[PDB]
Amino acid sequence: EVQLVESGGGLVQPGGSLRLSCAASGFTFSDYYMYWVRQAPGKGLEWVAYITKGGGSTYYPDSVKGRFTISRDNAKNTLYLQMNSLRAEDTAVYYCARQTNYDFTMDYWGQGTLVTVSSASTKGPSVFPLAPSSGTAALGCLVKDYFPEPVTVSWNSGALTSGVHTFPAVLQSSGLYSLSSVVTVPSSSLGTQTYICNVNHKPSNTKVDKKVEPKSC
Amino acid sequence: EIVMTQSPATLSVSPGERATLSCKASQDVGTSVAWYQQKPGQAPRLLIYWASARHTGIPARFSGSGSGTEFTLTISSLQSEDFAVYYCQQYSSYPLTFGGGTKVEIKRTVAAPSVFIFPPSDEQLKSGTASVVCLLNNFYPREAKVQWKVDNALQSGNSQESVTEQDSKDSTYSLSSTLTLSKADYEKHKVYACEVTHQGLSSPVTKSFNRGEC
Amino acid sequence: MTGTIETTGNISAEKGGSIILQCHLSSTTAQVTQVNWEQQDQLLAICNADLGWHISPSFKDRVAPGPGLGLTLQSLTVNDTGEYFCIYHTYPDGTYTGRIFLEVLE
Numbered sequence: 001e002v003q004l005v006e007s008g009g010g011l012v013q014p015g016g017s018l019r020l021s022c023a024a025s026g027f028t029f030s031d032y033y034m035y036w037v038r039q040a041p042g043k044g045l046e047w048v049a050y051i052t053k054g055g056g057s058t059y060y061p062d063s064v065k066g067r068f069t070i071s072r073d074n075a076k077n078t079l080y081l082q083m084n085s086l087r088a089e090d091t092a093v094y095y096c097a098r099q100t101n102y103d104f105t106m107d108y109w110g111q112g113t114l115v116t117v118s119s120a121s122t123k124g125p126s127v128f129p130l131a132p133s134s135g136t137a138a139l140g141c142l143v144k145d146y147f148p149e150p151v152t153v154s155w156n157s158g159a160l161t162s163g164v165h166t167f168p169a170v171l172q173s174s175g176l177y178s179l180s181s182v183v184t185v186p187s188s189s190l191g192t193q194t195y196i197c198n199v200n201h202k203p204s205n206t207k208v209d210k211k212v213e214p215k216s217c
Numbered sequence: 218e219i220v221m222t223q224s225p226a227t228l229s230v231s232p233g234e235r236a237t238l239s240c241k242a243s244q245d246v247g248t249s250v251a252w253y254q255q256k257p258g259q260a261p262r263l264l265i266y267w268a269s270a271r272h273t274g275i276p277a278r279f280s281g282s283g284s285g286t287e288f289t290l291t292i293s294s295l296q297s298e299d300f301a302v303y304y305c306q307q308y309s310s311y312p313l314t315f316g317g318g319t320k321v322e323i324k325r326t327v328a329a330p331s332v333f334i335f336p337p338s339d340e341q342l343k344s345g346t347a348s349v350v351c352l353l354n355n356f357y358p359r360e361a362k363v364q365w366k367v368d369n370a371l372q373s374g375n376s377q378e379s380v381t382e383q384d385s386k387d388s389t390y391s392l393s394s395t396l397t398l399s400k401a402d403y404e405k406h407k408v409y410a411c412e413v414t415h416q417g418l419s420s421p422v423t424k425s426f427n428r429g430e431c
Numbered sequence: 432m433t434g435t436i437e438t439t440g441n442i443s444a445e446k447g448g449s450i451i452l453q454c455h456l457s458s459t460t461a462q463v464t465q466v467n468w469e470q471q472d473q474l475l476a477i478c479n480a481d482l483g484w485h486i487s488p489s490f491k492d493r494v495a496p497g498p499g500l501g502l503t504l505q506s507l508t509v510n511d512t513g514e515y516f517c518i519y520h521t522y523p524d525g526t527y528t529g530r531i532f533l534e535v536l537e
Contacts, residue, residue, distance in 0.1 A: 033474075044304070045253075047315070052473050057473060061311070100263075100266060103477070103485060104488060106263060111259075126341070126344075128337070128338035128348070129338050130338075138333040138352055142395075165354075165391045167379040167391075167393040168381070170395075172397075180352075184331075217431040247485070248482065267479070267485065310488045311489075
């Protein structure tokens, strides 16, 4: 099974530099031509870098030319992207891709790693409850005021999955993201069953649980 | 550069039915045109190369046509799993360029949303700002209006909405509306209401709480 | 097993001119499904038996397919000096490979 793992994403200030990594397995990495492709949140796909099987030739679009440098180390089974003089609009999920050896395009992509270019400061989330009120009932969490993306949100350490909806973050006018995560349970379970949401925001090194109780009152 | 334009942007299709997607190259790209399926949260998956050749592991209900400047992907009997944004791409010359995509939703019977309102946490109140949250749960179609009444005054410019991707099991959608005020402004008012209109409700549905009761 | 590839051999050309690269699989009845043209470092073309010629975008300005199963290089640079390969994908025999060495001089 062909496998590609991207690494190196995170926040970087404009003008700065970052270096990305793709770790291959399950195919002779040295026989294959390799690509980088990028995708802004909500936008489309943009080819960013191409390199030959042995690294002899490299091709870039004008957008990144003279700032990005594609490369490989064939014994490390690794492909690298060196991003110099970064710009705001460089913000995207970056994928490495393998070329078909029977045509000239991309067959397999990694899952991606996300780069964020902003002057803004990292900040972790506060987590407030959405307490069940007045059959089935609904409860949830509010992961408010963090930067940058992403946050993951489990429920009961992965034991709660069916019925959950963890909403797309929306960016607020402050410059900070916020989202909600909800789940609908039976009412009768409310007096009986514990509900903890496990909020994780790795750019901040925050990981936090918040119990949500039918606050009687 | 070679601009690839897809059409239409969106396509809702009943299961078992056929969707037809269109990619149009700004100059002759030969048959060097590929199609990619990108499921939400996922990496692009290669479907078609050489404009007509299907990548191994791809069901034969996918099918690629075209040469020159006009290319066509066809999904002949859609399944729930085929819900994704589909991308075309020319590799005739550099820069390799992609379409804008065509999003494809699964069609199903109409489903009225379940609504819930959430007064701001007692702990966030100390923050100085308040956040009421409105949850529209498991509805279809995806169009819906959420308006915030604050003592029957309609709000404007202080709400933020968000919608899940189409649900994998029942093809529904869900919504989150979040109104934020000064905690100062929050205690100047008393009836907080979320008013929801959607094709599956005979009339708008409203849900509300009075600040202070609980 | 039985069947060889003849080629245009080791050849030489002025900078800025064209060359033809030609190969000929012979001494077998096995069907050719695909032919790849490659440099020592990059693949240049693929003739498919069903779908035709694709030309790698790294050479679209400077490479016409054919004549026949060959290939024509258009604006030769000294960078083009090196080995070239026609790879024959075949049934039932297998992969047949012929080789050409090009030297571009000034």
